[PDB]
């Protein structure tokens, strides 16, 4: 167990290597702030918006903008 091995077990084998690093970094930046399942949701929400271009609620967009800020550093 650990935070690094926990995040690594969230990878899906079909996930691109570049797309995984973006998901990895989001999960790592907020790991200590949300329970396991909510981080999964929020992390998927993040890469759905930045990578796939999906739109969510007015409110969730402002949350994922804030959370996602800086995870290309």
């Amino acid at each position: 167990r650990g935070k690094l091995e926990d995040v690594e077990a969230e990878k899906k084998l079909w996930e691109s290597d570049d797309a995984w690093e973006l998901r990895k970094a989001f999960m790592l930046a907020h790991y200590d702030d949300y329970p396991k399942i909510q981080l999964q949701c929020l992390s998927q929400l993040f890469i759905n918006v930045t990578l796939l271009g999906c739109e969510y609620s007015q409110t969730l967009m402002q949350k994922i903008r804030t959370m996602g800020a800086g995870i290309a550093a």
Binding site: W14, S16, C41, Q44, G53, C54, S57
Partner: protein
């Protein structure tokens, strides 16, 4: 009609027009080119036109829609005049492979229904500023045509009334069997039909000369007909382009003779099996296109992709000394052999396609494509093989679906784009593994994995919250909008819907907290249900059924196939059936759907022969 226009032009004799009465007495000899024993209906193809027709004005209410469906079945039946069996197959919960493509469709439709009304509102406001008067929730959601919804449950009840009414009142129904496979019986209608035929074929009592007729517009039905291996198999469908409603029969026996000449090969290294070359042809057709994978960029039906594979296939044959498939399992070293060959010619196809962003036609196309569509580049060819291997696994799953029944309820292709044929090198070492046991989803779980939030009416109230509110731990699965990649194609519906794949595990996890809030009715819609078989009071197996119906027992009784022209199976008491001699009040409030004063049909549960 991409595949049909190809087939019809290439083998024109396989198409034969239907004669139709324009007060019809169906007991009379069929005015068509032959008599028919079994009629199979892929119901989803009738329901969609009858509830939201895009060319006529839509029906007023649900009662009008149910009446039209009744009318439409009556119409097909009076044409085909099945003398033995009428099989009505509704879509149950599909395997995962289909669900992703069903999700794409319902998400896409709700987008269009919203764009419809956004343009309606735009026209109104345009007129109001020009100076034209304009007229002033009660819309039909074509997504409700999905297993688990209230609507599907209500259609199933209308079809029961329909079957009892016609089997009691219609003289031609007097000696036929009727099977009804509603949305609580898992499997797509066509595969339920496929499987009914297959399990019948496998029983010694089956009449190998039964005359089959399958009604539906999907092109797959041509291959289904081949794969049944049934001697006299036929499709009935509406004319592609016609001034009025006109039906045609696709005659599989005729296509067989055509294909028998197409697929003959001189100097074959191992015994020529016509039945086995047809099976390879079927596989090759699914290679070009099928419901569960994206089409390889180098294969388009309009570009003669099928003719090309045949020429490529015929070449393989003189190399590996055996057929491309055995009983639904493709030989993967031989797949790789055809893939390497198609890969040598991919570049030519793109350049030839050019004379007519990503540049498939100019050098370096493969790396831009893998950068554009997957965001990987040149370095990573482990990834290129990963999609290619995921892709062949798919083809194994498809061929196994038709020839032997579903191999995995959980398998799916987890990419939005297909690889190129040049990526399928090394695929020969892949060994498919579908031995993990899988069961279909429960209807409501599939609603959750196939609906957008726009169609949340159809779910239990506590479950709807999970689709819309921000605190929901699956709110990510229900985006309000999504981007559609045109992918070179012209129209938005030929493109790729960039929707996130459903986290099966996280969905079922979230639903645990809300499962106990289901009503009895909701728990009911969420249950795997049975098939039902019906006969009328004159049927020579009526008393047989009556014993089983009166036994009030759940043991499955083997049918006497002697009273059914060789139909095998097991039947059992249906506690919900309306008994002979009692009234059957119509669930469809319409002039054409009168109450039944005395039902003369018996209904029991049916199970295909093991």
């Amino acid at each position: 009609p991409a595949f049909f226009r190809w087939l019809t032009k290439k083998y024109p004799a396989t198409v034969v027009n239907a004669n139709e009465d324009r007060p019809v007495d169906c007991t009379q000899p069929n005015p068509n080119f032959q008599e028919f024993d079994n009629l199979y209906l892929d119901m989803n193809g009738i329901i969609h036109p009858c509830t939201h027709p895009e060319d006529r004005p839509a029906p007023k209410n649900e009662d009008e829609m149910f009446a039209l469906i009744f009318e439409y079945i009556d119409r097909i039946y009076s044409i085909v005049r099945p003398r033995r069996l009428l099989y009505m197959a509704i879509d149950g919960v599909a395997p995962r492979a289909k669900m992703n493509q069903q999700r794409s469709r319902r998400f896409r439709a709700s987008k269009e229904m919203a764009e419809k009304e956004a343009s309606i509102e735009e026209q109104r406001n345009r007129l109001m500023a020009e100076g034209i008067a304009v007229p002033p929730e009660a819309h039909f959601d074509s997504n409700c045509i999905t297993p688990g919804t209230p609507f599907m449950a209500r259609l199933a009840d209308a079809l029961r009334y329909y079957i009892h009414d016609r089997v009691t009142n219609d003289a031609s129904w007097a000696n036929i069997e009727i099977i009804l496979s509603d949305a609580n019986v898992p499997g797509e209608g066509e595969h339920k039909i496929m499987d009914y035929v297959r399990k019948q074929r496998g029983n010694p009592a089956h009449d190998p000369n039964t005359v089959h007729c399958l009604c539906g517009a999907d092109a797959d039905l041509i291959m289904l007909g081949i794969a049944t291996h049934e001697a006299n198999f036929n499709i009935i469908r509406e004319e592609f382009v016609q001034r009025e409603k006109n039906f045609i029969f696709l005659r599989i026996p005729v296509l067989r003779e055509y294909l028998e000449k197409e697929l003959s090969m001189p100097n074959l290294p191992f015994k020529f099996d016509v039945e086995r070359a047809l099976d390879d042809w079927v596989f090759l057709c699914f290679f070009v296109g099928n419901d569960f994978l994206p089409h390889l960029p180098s294969l388009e039906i309009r570009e003669g992709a099928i003719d090309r594979l045949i020429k490529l296939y015929k070449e393989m044959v003189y190399q590996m000394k055996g057929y491309l498939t055995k009983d639904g399992i493709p030989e993967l070293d031989r797949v790789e052999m055809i893939m390497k060959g198609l890969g040598r010619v991919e570049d030519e196809i793109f350049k030839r396609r050019q004379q007519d962003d990503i540049r498939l036609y100019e050098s370096g196309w493969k790396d831009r494509y893998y950068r554009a569509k997957f965001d990987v580049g040149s370095d990573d060819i482990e990834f290129r093989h990963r999609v290619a291997w995921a892709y062949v696994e798919g083809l194994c799953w498809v061929l196994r679906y038709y020839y032997q029944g579903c191999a995995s309820w959980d398998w799916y292709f987890p990419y939005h784009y297909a690889p190129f044929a040049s990526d399928f090198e090394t695929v020969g070492e892949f060994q498919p593994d579908f031995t993990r046991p899988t069961k279909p989803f429960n209807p409501l779980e599939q609603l959750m994995s196939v609906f957008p939030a726009a169609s949340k009416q159809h779910l239990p109230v506590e479950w709807q919250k999970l689709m819309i509110q921000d605190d929901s731990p699956i709110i990510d699965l229900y985006p309000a909008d999504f981007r559609i990649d045109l992918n070179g194609k012209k129209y938005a519906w030929q493109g790729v819907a960039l929707l996130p794949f459903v986290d099966e595990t996280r969905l079922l996890a979230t639903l645990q907290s809300v499962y106990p809030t289901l009503t009895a009715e909701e728990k009911q819609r969420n249950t795997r249900g049975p098939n039902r078989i019906f006969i009328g009071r004159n049927h020579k197996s009526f008393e047989f059924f009556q014993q089983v119906a009166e036994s009030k027992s759940d043991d499955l009784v083997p049918l006497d196939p002697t009273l059914l022209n060789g139909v095998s199976g097991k039947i059992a008491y249906d506690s919900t059936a309306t008994a002979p001699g009692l009234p059957f009040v119509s669930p469809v409030n319409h002039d054409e759907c009168q109450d039944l004063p005395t039902n003369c049909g018996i209904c029991v549960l049916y199970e295909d022969p093991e």
